[PDB]
Amino acid sequence: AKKVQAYVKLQVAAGMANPSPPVGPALGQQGVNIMEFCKAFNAKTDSIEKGLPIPVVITVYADRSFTFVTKTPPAAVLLKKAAGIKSGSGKPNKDKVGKISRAQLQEIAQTKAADMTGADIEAMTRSIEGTARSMGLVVED
Amino acid sequence: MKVRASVKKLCRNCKIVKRDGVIRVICSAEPKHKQRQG
Amino acid sequence: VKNELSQYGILPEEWGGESQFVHVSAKAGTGIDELLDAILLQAEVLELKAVRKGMASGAVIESFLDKGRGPVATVLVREGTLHKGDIVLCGFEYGRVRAMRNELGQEVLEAGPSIPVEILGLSGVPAAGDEVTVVRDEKKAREVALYRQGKFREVKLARQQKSKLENMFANMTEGEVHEVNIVLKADVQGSVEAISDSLLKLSTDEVKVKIIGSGVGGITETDATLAAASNAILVGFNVRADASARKVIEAESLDLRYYSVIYNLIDEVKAAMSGMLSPELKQQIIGLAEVRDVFKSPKFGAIAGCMVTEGVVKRHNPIRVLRDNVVIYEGELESLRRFKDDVNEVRNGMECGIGVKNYNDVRTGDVIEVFEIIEIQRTIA
Amino acid sequence: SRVAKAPVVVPAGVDVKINGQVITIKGKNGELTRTLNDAVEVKHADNTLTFGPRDGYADGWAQAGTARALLNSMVIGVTEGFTKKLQLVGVGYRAAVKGNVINLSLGFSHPVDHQLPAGITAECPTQTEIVLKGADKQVIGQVAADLRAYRRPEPYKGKGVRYADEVVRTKEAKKK
Amino acid sequence: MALNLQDKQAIVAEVSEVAKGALSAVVADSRGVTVDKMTELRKAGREAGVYMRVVRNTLLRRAVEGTPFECLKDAFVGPTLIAYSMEHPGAAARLFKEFAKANAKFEVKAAAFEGEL
Amino acid sequence: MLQPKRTKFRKMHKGRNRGLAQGTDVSFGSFGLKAVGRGRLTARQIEAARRAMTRAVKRQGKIWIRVFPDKPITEKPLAVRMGKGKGNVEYWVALIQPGKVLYEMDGVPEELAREAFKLAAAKLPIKTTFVTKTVM
RNA sequence: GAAGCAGCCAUCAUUUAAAGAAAGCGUAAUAGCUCACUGGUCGAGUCGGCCUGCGCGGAAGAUGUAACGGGGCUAAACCAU
């Protein structure tokens, strides 16, 4: 497709699923389409692994095969497969909730290199590390 | 608009330009920043 | 309008499940022909089968008081043929119907299954928005009504128990207490119950506004007596005073208002609460003065010679006598003397003397801060 | 600096008349289009009007870039023409064109009937859009401003006359 | 900023090598989205940032000197912000087709659109 | 504020301000602030000027104060006639000659030390300029 | 109708030419529309301070110009010779 003008966008992993009111006038304008969960997120799972955060994009068009905005599970699969809640840390934190390592945690979701931009390996670890300082999993020098 | 002895400036989109005997403060992004005097 | 209601679950036309839309003009005033056909068509498509030859039932639309015809009510009858002689039970109201009166035509004897008709001659005012049913006998509908009075006593004891356990207190928890009371009578009984709720809605915590003795119909002797007993504003909607209220009012002229619109009433209760509200907040210096060279006097004990270092000094204002962030002594400015004579005011750079009753406590180099206090009058919103 | 020091182009079949210090270009449309000059020296050189500072003045380049922009715009005016659409935001507002007047109803009881100079012409694609084209950028811009003067933009709701390029600059209603 | 005479020396020896070989890229960007290049980048995540990088290198007035005489066919730059790639297996390799299927949304010019032999 | 601990005497002559200041060299600061003009610098002023730049960087760095209020100034009440003995003690003042380094400052970056004196400058009553440490 | 710019936290890095988990308008929120940063284009001067000479603003009053003596002057001023 070729139109991104009006849509509604949500995070829909596990029992966390959905920011609060999609039954309001936000999504009540729209026509209907079943496909796009099964088309967009559901592509990438068996090439990667399980333990992936789940974003979603809700829209409708004539050809019934519309263009995904999010292509992929959100980057920090290495953290989110290992621990916490399926969407992520389940709470924003400076500290407390965990730690990140260089002796055993590298290889857990090694398959997500295939649909992460995060390339050769030493930068790929640091790219999820700042995401983990967001989530709270900070470790001393 | 404001009158003050000092122009002082506000943001980078404030131009700060003279008209006749009178400096003005002209801000593209913000009419709240408007001034004369100087 | 069609597109904007296609953003909601209102059953919109065609794009939704079709609540049908009609396009006609009522503000300007141009028919409306189509709308009349649509209303009939929905009622024909619906199944409206009803008893026309049996017994009568229905609901009360709106109830009011007449002073020659008694308590009355406009009652829509759902089930046909309310007769001339029938016994009626509506909630806690009972009676045999004396007569039935209508605005489409004055004198009604046997009613339809879809029409409002005024009833008159009842024990009290029947509640609006609930059920009237014809009954076998008058004697039994006393006994039911007295059971329903027992039920109103159950609702009385419920409303009596609730107020004490909600916040411990009988009324107000904190010591900064303010309230407003009102006494209210609306002409229509559906209205009195609805707008009284809206006058208890608007309240703040600090000033609490409350109804005491909601009435239906004209102001009477005992209604004026309640606001004479405990201070409240006495208001009535389209309601006005009668002679036995006037007798109390001419004796003690309470706050008496018979009214125009409900918005101005909701504004004037807010205005009353705002006038009720405690008024002051601002404490700001007028002057600062330094003490030197004590004298002794039988007028006040000690006399602290002063030199006002900053600001203005005025005869009566609160003072703070302080040294290094402690208040040494406390007071209200008692005596302002300059040179040899008491004077109304003094300004910085001037020799002064001051002493306060039971002040004997002078230390040189202590400082007096005289300060102005300024009212603000908070307004409820 | 740079463009004040640049010769401006002459595209043939322009008049390119100079008579004392006036410069009079009619060309591919319009009439007249005359400016009068001061302390800017200028040399016609076939395909350009080449500029420089005139005798003894301290305003070299600074008067000249003015003249540079002027004889450019006169050449552009005789060839292309100028400005764009006035759009009517604010519900119920309406534009009625006649050859003399652009009449508007912008919530005013009296009708405006705004009269248009003859070097410019105006058009109504719609009752809400007013489009105009004409000889000179100074005069056409002043006419758009005189139209804009009747109901100015307001950041509460954006009502009145836009050009379709200015900021909305929305400011929230603070009943909150 | 940069003094051109000292700066150009280090660059040209690595940059020129792609042009000399069997095939070289001429990828472009204009009114598309970088997020789709980050799509081709998460494809290049598989190869660890080598083959499918779609490298938006595009300098000509600080770099890409004319000392080799066969490198200026593919190295011209302008509007439509230019991007390089990396080539080694050659002979119409099937690695390209993963880059190819994304062309439905357009993302301007790409390798071998200029009709050279 | 600030004042001498014990009186040599409790009042003083007016005096004069001819000649440039002796103390023109930075002792201890990386930076400081030097007075171009001359004038009277109050004890409220020196209190205020230190307080503002302290607040700005919160607790970063260290400042020295070269200036000191040495002598009193007396002043007359409103009502009194001329003569009848010298005025009473009213305040303490730092009298300065032109070229005097007022403040000095070390443990901050350069621009933040410029800001600190720019902030302090409006509390000061007379024309001043910024200084760097240097050698003899 | 939140995915940088309504909120709260992280106060970092990746992918990378170049792009800070992004500064604003804007969008129902992304996008739109740009900045920061750089490519193409064009073409030489470009950018911020410092010390001094002379101006501008800061500059509102009481019977009538009413603070060059006045007319009046851009030399009939000012500075140096």
mmCIF file of N, CA and C (backbone and C1' of nucleotides) in Angstrom, chain G residues 20-37:
data_model
loop_
_atom_site.group_PDB
_atom_site.id
_atom_site.type_symbol
_atom_site.label_atom_id
_atom_site.label_comp_id
_atom_site.label_asym_id
_atom_site.label_seq_id
_atom_site.Cartn_x
_atom_site.Cartn_y
_atom_site.Cartn_z
ATOM 1 P P G G 20 23.349 10.148 16.436
ATOM 2 O "O5'" G G 20 23.023 10.483 17.963
ATOM 3 C "C5'" G G 20 23.872 11.372 18.727
ATOM 4 C "C4'" G G 20 23.050 12.263 19.673
ATOM 5 C "C3'" G G 20 21.805 11.675 20.392
ATOM 6 O "O3'" G G 20 22.089 10.997 21.640
ATOM 7 C "C1'" G G 20 21.157 13.595 19.228
ATOM 8 P P A G 21 21.966 9.414 21.765
ATOM 9 O "O5'" A G 21 20.399 9.175 21.519
ATOM 10 C "C5'" A G 21 19.750 7.956 21.953
ATOM 11 C "C4'" A G 21 18.260 7.932 21.532
ATOM 12 C "C3'" A G 21 17.259 8.713 22.397
ATOM 13 O "O3'" A G 21 17.263 10.106 22.064
ATOM 14 C "C1'" A G 21 16.308 6.659 21.594
ATOM 15 P P A G 22 17.638 11.247 23.094
ATOM 16 O "O5'" A G 22 17.820 12.504 22.122
ATOM 17 C "C5'" A G 22 17.283 12.454 20.776
ATOM 18 C "C4'" A G 22 17.092 13.872 20.254
ATOM 19 C "C3'" A G 22 15.751 14.396 20.772
ATOM 20 O "O3'" A G 22 15.739 15.833 20.894
ATOM 21 C "C1'" A G 22 15.588 13.941 18.439
ATOM 22 P P A G 23 15.860 16.584 22.284
ATOM 23 O "O5'" A G 23 15.010 17.868 21.910
ATOM 24 C "C5'" A G 23 15.023 19.051 22.722
ATOM 25 C "C4'" A G 23 14.784 20.320 21.880
ATOM 26 C "C3'" A G 23 13.467 20.393 21.070
ATOM 27 O "O3'" A G 23 12.397 20.780 21.937
ATOM 28 C "C1'" A G 23 15.205 20.880 19.617
ATOM 29 P P G G 24 10.907 20.262 21.756
ATOM 30 O "O5'" G G 24 10.352 21.159 20.560
ATOM 31 C "C5'" G G 24 10.140 22.573 20.855
ATOM 32 C "C4'" G G 24 9.850 23.425 19.601
ATOM 33 C "C3'" G G 24 8.510 23.037 18.958
ATOM 34 O "O3'" G G 24 7.442 23.697 19.703
ATOM 35 C "C1'" G G 24 10.224 23.070 17.289
ATOM 36 P P C G 25 5.958 23.129 19.733
ATOM 37 O "O5'" C G 25 5.424 23.501 18.298
ATOM 38 C "C5'" C G 25 5.004 24.825 17.900
ATOM 39 C "C4'" C G 25 4.778 24.850 16.376
ATOM 40 C "C3'" C G 25 3.660 24.033 15.673
ATOM 41 O "O3'" C G 25 2.345 24.650 15.713
ATOM 42 C "C1'" C G 25 5.699 23.744 14.523
ATOM 43 P P G G 26 1.031 23.766 15.892
ATOM 44 O "O5'" G G 26 1.120 22.788 14.658
ATOM 45 C "C5'" G G 26 0.904 23.008 13.257
ATOM 46 C "C4'" G G 26 1.270 21.724 12.464
ATOM 47 C "C3'" G G 26 0.428 20.479 12.775
ATOM 48 O "O3'" G G 26 -0.794 20.502 11.992
ATOM 49 C "C1'" G G 26 2.725 19.909 12.879
ATOM 50 P P U G 27 -2.137 19.970 12.627
ATOM 51 O "O5'" U G 27 -1.958 18.407 12.592
ATOM 52 C "C5'" U G 27 -1.978 17.605 11.404
ATOM 53 C "C4'" U G 27 -1.678 16.139 11.760
ATOM 54 C "C3'" U G 27 -2.565 15.529 12.850
ATOM 55 O "O3'" U G 27 -3.852 15.162 12.296
ATOM 56 C "C1'" U G 27 -0.284 14.903 13.164
ATOM 57 P P A G 28 -5.176 15.566 13.073
ATOM 58 O "O5'" A G 28 -5.041 14.777 14.441
ATOM 59 C "C5'" A G 28 -4.752 15.504 15.662
ATOM 60 C "C4'" A G 28 -4.677 14.576 16.887
ATOM 61 C "C3'" A G 28 -3.608 13.478 16.671
ATOM 62 O "O3'" A G 28 -2.286 13.838 17.107
ATOM 63 C "C1'" A G 28 -5.712 12.463 16.876
ATOM 64 P P A G 29 -1.745 14.480 18.449
ATOM 65 O "O5'" A G 29 -0.311 13.790 18.580
ATOM 66 C "C5'" A G 29 0.009 12.792 19.566
ATOM 67 C "C4'" A G 29 0.637 11.498 18.995
ATOM 68 C "C3'" A G 29 1.701 11.639 17.917
ATOM 69 O "O3'" A G 29 2.962 12.030 18.531
ATOM 70 C "C1'" A G 29 0.177 9.858 17.383
ATOM 71 P P U G 30 4.159 12.424 17.556
ATOM 72 O "O5'" U G 30 4.364 11.085 16.730
ATOM 73 C "C5'" U G 30 5.120 11.065 15.517
ATOM 74 C "C4'" U G 30 5.268 9.638 14.973
ATOM 75 C "C3'" U G 30 5.835 9.674 13.553
ATOM 76 O "O3'" U G 30 7.282 9.784 13.515
ATOM 77 C "C1'" U G 30 3.912 8.356 13.552
ATOM 78 P P A G 31 7.797 11.129 12.786
ATOM 79 O "O5'" A G 31 7.136 11.074 11.324
ATOM 80 C "C5'" A G 31 7.502 10.086 10.346
ATOM 81 C "C4'" A G 31 6.417 9.892 9.258
ATOM 82 C "C3'" A G 31 6.276 11.068 8.278
ATOM 83 O "O3'" A G 31 7.258 11.043 7.210
ATOM 84 C "C1'" A G 31 4.148 10.477 9.029
ATOM 85 P P G G 32 8.005 12.428 6.919
ATOM 86 O "O5'" G G 32 6.789 13.432 6.612
ATOM 87 C "C5'" G G 32 5.957 13.351 5.429
ATOM 88 C "C4'" G G 32 4.721 14.307 5.463
ATOM 89 C "C3'" G G 32 5.018 15.829 5.420
ATOM 90 O "O3'" G G 32 5.190 16.349 4.078
ATOM 91 C "C1'" G G 32 3.730 15.435 7.264
ATOM 92 P P C G 33 6.371 17.390 3.873
ATOM 93 O "O5'" C G 33 5.771 18.611 4.689
ATOM 94 C "C5'" C G 33 6.241 19.966 4.570
ATOM 95 C "C4'" C G 33 7.169 20.423 5.727
ATOM 96 C "C3'" C G 33 8.663 20.065 5.599
ATOM 97 O "O3'" C G 33 9.259 20.815 4.515
ATOM 98 C "C1'" C G 33 7.927 19.900 7.879
ATOM 99 P P U G 34 10.793 20.865 4.098
ATOM 100 O "O5'" U G 34 11.478 21.253 5.439
ATOM 101 C "C5'" U G 34 12.870 21.189 5.758
ATOM 102 C "C4'" U G 34 12.998 21.478 7.257
ATOM 103 C "C3'" U G 34 14.361 21.338 7.930
ATOM 104 O "O3'" U G 34 15.096 22.570 7.741
ATOM 105 C "C1'" U G 34 12.603 20.415 9.294
ATOM 106 P P C G 35 16.653 22.604 7.527
ATOM 107 O "O5'" C G 35 17.162 22.254 9.001
ATOM 108 C "C5'" C G 35 17.021 23.339 9.974
ATOM 109 C "C4'" C G 35 17.260 22.880 11.416
ATOM 110 C "C3'" C G 35 18.668 22.409 11.807
ATOM 111 O "O3'" C G 35 19.545 23.547 12.080
ATOM 112 C "C1'" C G 35 17.006 20.921 12.649
ATOM 113 P P A G 36 21.054 23.449 11.578
ATOM 114 O "O5'" A G 36 21.695 22.350 12.509
ATOM 115 C "C5'" A G 36 22.185 22.505 13.854
ATOM 116 C "C4'" A G 36 22.447 21.116 14.479
ATOM 117 C "C3'" A G 36 23.574 20.262 13.854
ATOM 118 O "O3'" A G 36 24.893 20.576 14.370
ATOM 119 C "C1'" A G 36 21.604 18.954 14.141
ATOM 120 P P C G 37 26.036 21.056 13.374
ATOM 121 O "O5'" C G 37 26.309 19.820 12.385
ATOM 122 C "C5'" C G 37 26.851 18.575 12.873
ATOM 123 C "C4'" C G 37 26.748 17.380 11.884
ATOM 124 C "C3'" C G 37 27.200 17.466 10.385
ATOM 125 O "O3'" C G 37 28.636 17.327 10.216
ATOM 126 C "C1'" C G 37 25.085 16.495 10.454
#
